[PDB]
Each structure stands twice: as C-alpha cells, then as structure tokens.
Design a protein around this ligand. Sequence first.
Ligand SMILES: CCCCCCCc1cc(O)cc(O)c1C(=O)O
Ligand SMILES: CCCCCCCc1cc(O)cc(O)c1C(=O)O
Lengths: 104, 104
Amino acid sequence: GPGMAVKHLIVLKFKDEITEAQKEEFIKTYVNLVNIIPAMKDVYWGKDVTQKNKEEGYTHIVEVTFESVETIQDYIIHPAHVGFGDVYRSFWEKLLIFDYTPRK
Amino acid sequence: GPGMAVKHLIVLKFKDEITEAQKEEFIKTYVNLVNIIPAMKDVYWGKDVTQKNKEEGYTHIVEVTFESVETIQDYIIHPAHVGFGDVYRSFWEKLLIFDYTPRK
Ligand SMILES: CCCCCCCc1cc(O)cc(O)c1C(=O)O
Ligand SMILES: CCCCCCCc1cc(O)cc(O)c1C(=O)O
C-alpha cells in the first residue's frame, strides 16, 4: 500500500555471562510488550549466523514497525518499556538503534 | 510460510567528505546488482532519522533478501560484488554485516 511507516531496528550483543536460556527469556519478555504498549505493533527477530563483524560481535537483530518516529518515542517512554530497559540493561554489552522508512 | 529466505543486513557509515551525489550513485550501483547477481532477490534501504548512536555514525541500513546462506555466499564471491568493493571501498568508513532469518 502507499503507507509511510517507520521501522525501529535494534542490534544487540549480550554480555558473555548471559546464558542462552536467559537470552530467550529476555526476548520473550520483550515480545510481550506488544500487548501492553499501544504504539508497538509487531516484533520480528533473528540471530546472526555469519559472525563477520570481528570486534563488534553483535548477535541479535530485532525489527519493530511503528506508524512514525513520534510513536517510537511513545514506546521509548512508556512505563513498561522504561521498566524493561532498566531491569535488563545489564544484559547487553553493545546496543545500536536505528529508525528508518524502508524504500527502494 | 512456504518460502524460505535469509535477510542480509548491512549497516553503513560513509566517510564524512563523501557528497550526497556520491552516496546516491553508490547506492544506485549497489541496488543495480540485483540485475547482475542472480542470488540477489530484492533490496530495501533507508537512512536513519533518530541518531540514537550518533557517536558511532552509522547512517544507512540496507536489507537484501536471499533464498539461503548458500546463495548469500554466491553473492559474496560474485565478480560484480568483488568489483563493487574494488571501486567503492574507499567511500565507506565502516560497516556491519548480518545474516539472519527473521521470526516471531
Ligand atoms: C529484544 C531486544 C530488546 C532491546 C532492548 C533495548 C531497550 C532500549 C534501551 C535503550 O537504552 C534505548 C532504546 O532505544 C531501547 C529500545 O529502543 O527499545
Ligand atoms: C548500499 C550498500 C553497500 C554495501 C557494500 C558492502 C559490501 C561488503 C563489504 C564487505 O567488506 C563485506 C561484505 O559482506 C559486504 C556485503 O555483504 O556486501
């Protein structure tokens, strides 16, 4: 369709001490935010398989579509997001966030 | 669904002196690889608008769809991919490369 939505992309490396089970629980709890935060519509994620970034070893990629930058910002400040981010902040070693409208 | 795909995600920062005209031509030549490299099925890209990692400087996000990790390898070793790097490596400052299958 003709819509102009905005994708929120998260690129993450967990601390080495975090176990696979802990990463899974972190992602599951994150996905549950869709049911809580109005702006947050859907979550797709995946684990990188090629490990091509050397000293910048991000492993997980999360994609969330939103209607605009302003509603991304609503998600950022929503108390369920603030709470998730604060209590799991020690899980990650590196985090990059991008917001863009995909085009051809 | 019935189809299998792997997303090849590139995060890119151009050198600071590169012009907008140069970026546009660089991207047009990259997306034209779909007409050259069989494995490369589609490209969507966008420019970050929120600058949440401004200090790292990545600005462009490029999403390329492939059938499998094997066809991704065919893309990497294709002469036109090697040749794109021959001609344009001097335009980028840094990159991150990921290969993953998005899921819920
Ligand atoms: C399954 C991956 C979970 C990602 C948590 C990141 C939370 C966060 C922290 C922050 O300092 C800035 C942010 O923009 C965000 C975010 O966008 O969600
Ligand atoms: C408009 C996007 C331009 C992307 C060029 C990156 C080329 C490249 C360089 C490299 O050193 C390693 C790689 O894996 C790749 C790649 O995946 O294409």
